[PDB]
Amino acid sequence: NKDIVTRSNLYKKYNQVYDRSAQSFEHVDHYLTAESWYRPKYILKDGKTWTQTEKDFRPLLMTWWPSQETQRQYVNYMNAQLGINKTYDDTSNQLQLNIAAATIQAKIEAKITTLKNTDWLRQTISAFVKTQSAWNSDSEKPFDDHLQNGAVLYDNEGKLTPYANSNYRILNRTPTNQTGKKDPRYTADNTIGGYEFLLANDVDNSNPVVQAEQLNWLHFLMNFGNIYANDPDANFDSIRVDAVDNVDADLLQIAGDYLKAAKGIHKNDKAANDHLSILEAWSDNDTPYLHDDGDNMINMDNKLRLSLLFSLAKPLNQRSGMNPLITNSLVNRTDDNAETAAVPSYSFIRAHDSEVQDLIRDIIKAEINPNVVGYSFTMEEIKKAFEIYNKDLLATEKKYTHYNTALSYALLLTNKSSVPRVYYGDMFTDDGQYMAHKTINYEAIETLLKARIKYVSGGQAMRNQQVGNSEIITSVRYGKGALKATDTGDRTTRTSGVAVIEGNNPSLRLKASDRVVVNMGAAHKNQAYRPLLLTTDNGIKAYHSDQEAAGLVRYTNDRGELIFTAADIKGYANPQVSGYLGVWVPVGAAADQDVRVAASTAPSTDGKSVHQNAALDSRVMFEGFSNFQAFATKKEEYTNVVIAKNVDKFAEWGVTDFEMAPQYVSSTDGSFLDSVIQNGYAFTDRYDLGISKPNKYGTADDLVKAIKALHSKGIKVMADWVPDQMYAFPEKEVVTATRVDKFGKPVEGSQIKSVLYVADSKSSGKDQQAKYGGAFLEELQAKYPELFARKQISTGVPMDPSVKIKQWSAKYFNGTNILGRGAGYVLKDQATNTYFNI
Ligand SMILES: [Ca+2]
Numbered sequence: 001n002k003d004i005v006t007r008s009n010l011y012k013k014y015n016q017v018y019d020r021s022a023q024s025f026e027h028v029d030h031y032l033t034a035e036s037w038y039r040p041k042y043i044l045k046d047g048k049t050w051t052q053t054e055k056d057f058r059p060l061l062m063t064w065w066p067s068q069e070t071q072r073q074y075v076n077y078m079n080a081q082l083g084i085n086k087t088y089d090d091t092s093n094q095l096q097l098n099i100a101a102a103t104i105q106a107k108i109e110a111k112i113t114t115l116k117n118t119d120w121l122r123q124t125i126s127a128f129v130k131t132q133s134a135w136n137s138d139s140e141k142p143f144d145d146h147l148q149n150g151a152v153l154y155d156n157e158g159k160l161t162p163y164a165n166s167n168y169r170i171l172n173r174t175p176t177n178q179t180g181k182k183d184p185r186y187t188a189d190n191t192i193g194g195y196e197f198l199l200a201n202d203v204d205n206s207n208p209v210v211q212a213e214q215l216n217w218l219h220f221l222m223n224f225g226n227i228y229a230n231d232p233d234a235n236f237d238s239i240r241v242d243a244v245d246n247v248d249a250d251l252l253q254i255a256g257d258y259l260k261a262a263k264g265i266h267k268n269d270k271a272a273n274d275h276l277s278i279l280e281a282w283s284d285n286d287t288p289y290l291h292d293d294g295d296n297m298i299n300m301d302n303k304l305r306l307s308l309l310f311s312l313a314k315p316l317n318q319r320s321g322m323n324p325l326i327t328n329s330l331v332n333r334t335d336d337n338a339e340t341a342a343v344p345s346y347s348f349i350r351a352h353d354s355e356v357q358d359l360i361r362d363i364i365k366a367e368i369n370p371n372v373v374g375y376s377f378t379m380e381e382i383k384k385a386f387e388i389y390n391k392d393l394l395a396t397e398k399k400y401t402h403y404n405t406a407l408s409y410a411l412l413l414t415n416k417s418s419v420p421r422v423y424y425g426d427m428f429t430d431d432g433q434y435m436a437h438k439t440i441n442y443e444a445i446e447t448l449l450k451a452r453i454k455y456v457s458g459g460q461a462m463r464n465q466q467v468g469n470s471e472i473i474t475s476v477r478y479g480k481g482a483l484k485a486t487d488t489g490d491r492t493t494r495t496s497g498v499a500v501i502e503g504n505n506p507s508l509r510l511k512a513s514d515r516v517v518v519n520m521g522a523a524h525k526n527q528a529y530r531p532l533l534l535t536t537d538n539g540i541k542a543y544h545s546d547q548e549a550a551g552l553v554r555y556t557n558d559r560g561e562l563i564f565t566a567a568d569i570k571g572y573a574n575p576q577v578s579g580y581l582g583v584w585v586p587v588g589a590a591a592d593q594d595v596r597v598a599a600s601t602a603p604s605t606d607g608k609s610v611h612q613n614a615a616l617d618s619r620v621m622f623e624g625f626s627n628f629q630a631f632a633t634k635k636e637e638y639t640n641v642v643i644a645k646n647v648d649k650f651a652e653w654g655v656t657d658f659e660m661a662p663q664y665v666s667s668t669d670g671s672f673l674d675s676v677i678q679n680g681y682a683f684t685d686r687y688d689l690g691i692s693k694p695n696k697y698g699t700a701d702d703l704v705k706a707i708k709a710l711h712s713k714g715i716k717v718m719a720d721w722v723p724d725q726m727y728a729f730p731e732k733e734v735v736t737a738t739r740v741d742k743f744g745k746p747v748e749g750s751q752i753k754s755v756l757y758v759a760d761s762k763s764s765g766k767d768q769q770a771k772y773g774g775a776f777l778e779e780l781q782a783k784y785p786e787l788f789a790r791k792q793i794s795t796g797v798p799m800d801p802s803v804k805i806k807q808w809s810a811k812y813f814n815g816t817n818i819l820g821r822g823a824g825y826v827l828k829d830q831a832t833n834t835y836f837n838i
């Protein structure tokens with residue numbers, strides 16, 4: 001318990017602790033750590049004269065050691081640090097070691113007076129502690145496939161840490177596994193459809209008090225303008241649910257219920273489309289889960305992503321056939337004639353995380369360091385990887401980066417029955433200042449986005465034709481008002497629609513007798529067509545008007561068929577195309593032609609909130625950041641400042657939904673990619689949206705101006721809801737902990753098995769969390785009582801708003817990534833085998 005901490009020290013009555021008080025020890029929850037300092041009764045001032053101790057704290061390992069072997073190692077170490085040329089071996093006795101320590105002590109106090117400070121000794125003792133297997137990674141091994149090498153799970157009933165107890169920490173309650181059993185309804189994924197421990201400090205989203213706080217935070221983000229700036233035009237309109245497969249899926253009912261109660265998205269498409277919210281949910285069970293739950297949010301179409309990636313973007317010898325582009329999707333686009341698609345979705349080829357950091361890892365693991373752990377890169381590894389990356393982008397033969405980006409975007413931006421999401425890093429450089437440098441594909445993508453507003457409407461037909469040595473796909477939109485190939489349309493149908501012709505093989509050669517006959521639809525008999533995009537020897541030629549293409553007009557026949565031959569279609573191999581891209585639009589669309597349609601106020605009657613109809617198809621999502629954006633050097637280069645200045649560009653592209661980066665002030669621990677490039681996903685304060693300090697994207701005021709500028713053009717703005725984990729807490733806590741895998745299963749024969757461990761898991765209690773934490777739970781329970789009545793699926797009980805989280809503490813977390821502090825960091829009395837409690 002509390003004894004006296006010392007025949008280990010022969011200056012025992014000088015070096016013994018000032019008093020029996022707690023104020024004379026650097027403790028964590030009244031326990032002592034190998035790095036704990038204390039106030040002795042006397043200091044050996046300048047290693048000369050025993051002086052009698054104000055702010056004169058000294059290391060405990062100066063005068064106390066857990067084992068005699070540790071004293072030896074401490075003597076050997078500090079001898080080498082202070083220039084004492086003498087080591088002591090295995091057979092040395094206790095008197096020799098005590099005199100060695102009572103010499104080290106003297107020279108320590110000499111250097112404290114010479115150097116006039118103590119930092120050097122903090123670093124020297126820390127360094128010594130990290131050499132001992134019981135106080136470093138050695139006792140935390142073996143490592144597992146956790147992104148940060150391993151995790152520890154906080155025990156629900158800890159006799160020595162009752163303040164860290166919980167009746168919850170219910171793990172792996174993914175949408176698939178929400179009830180603690182695999183859902184029998186969803187068979188596309190044989191697994192439990194995710195895992196609890198992803199990164200850093202894992203928030204216990206099974207805790208009813210934490211569930212209430214996540215809703216509190218959700219309300220805050222959807223009212224950020226009203227709350228921060230008393231400005232109702234600066235609110236986030238929508239959310240992205242980050243890391244769905246790594247959190248308790250009760251948050252999906254909580255967020256869906258909130259959108260229904262607060263925004264009325266279930267009433268009609270106008271409400272739903274004004275607050276269009278998305279998941280990042282990787283399991284193939286999550287889409288059908290979300291559909292049954294009421295389409296309160298939309299998921300990615302992961303099948304179409306993989307179809308694009310493997311048909312178009314992969315290297316030439318790893319490339320699949322093209323037919324997946326038609327059939328391997330939530331929607332079979334062979335003949336899509338539906339007023340409303342069965343399931344709503346968003347579609348993409350890349351995102352901030354998907355096919356960016358994966359490519360940087362491939363480059364690092366290849367040409368620099370093969371022992372890289374997950375995505376835990378150093379900034380130097382990143383900077384040099386990007387020299388290889390940026391050169392590969394402009395190569396015809398790419399070894400690392402995507403082929404056929406423009407072919408992918410031609411399908412994404414003409415496909416029916418999905419909301420396309422354009423990735424920032426496909427129009428601008430993944431690195432560098434925001435919107436500073438255009439990619440070689442910027443023009444093609446910009447042309448398609450403007451064309452989409454003007455031409456892309458009506459039913460869809462995709463065909464896969466075997467011709468010459470290879471294959472092509474055609475994708476057609478029949479024009480506004482023409483759902484079917486037989487619809488003869490009105491005037492606007494005639495001057496809308498589009499044909500996309502694509503091949504994914506550079507050797508594609510048509511025989512002289514080969515015809516590609518593309519049915520444009522019954523509205524397009526005997527009609528002039530002109531190119532929008534054509535593949536050339538060196539890249540892609542874009543056509544910004546009918547007149548720019550005046551020389552390349554061709555005609556449909558009396559059956560409404562465009563016909564192409566060897567003269568028109570062949571394989572190419574340049575930095576932009578590896579195969580063929582041709583895009584054709586009808587001649588004579590007015591300069592201001594817009595075939596998009598607004599969401600109706602008519603009541604929804606199918607029990608779903610979001611409907612993949614012409615109104616949702618008219619939307620475009622923009623992922624408005626890159627992980628590897630440069631840090632701003634001046635205020636004009638801040639992302640949110642550039643966004644406000646360039647908002648006219650987004651409206652011109654038909655961006656309806658601007659997905660902003662997470663706006664939380666980033667932690668700087670560098671324990672993951674996210675906390676090295678400071679994207680916003682690694683944070684300590686959920687409510688610090690550039691308030692205490694700028695985020696990577698600017699000040700809180702810069703954010704407010706960015707949201708208002710986007711709102712000024714009718715553009716909705718999405719907040720990144722990130723309830724899975726938090727990084728780099730400033731206050732230590734002692735927890736009873738067990739070494740686990742990412743699923744929370746206890747490991748082999750770990751020395752960390754219901755033992756004390758020192759976590760960084762307490763917030764300051766003086767941050768934005770302390771101000772806004774649970775601040776809106778009374779307002780929410782008053783307006784929307786049904787939210788707090790619902791018995792959540794994973795727990796069987798409602799959210800508990802009776803407690804407010806002003807300070808994060810281990811009792812609200814499942815556990816943490818291993819911190820390299822070891823299984824024995826909390827000091828015991830050698831004799832009693834008892835943890836020191838003060
Ligand atoms: Ca989790």
Ligand SMILES: [Cl-]
Pocket residue numbers: 335336337338
């Ligand atoms: Cl259909």
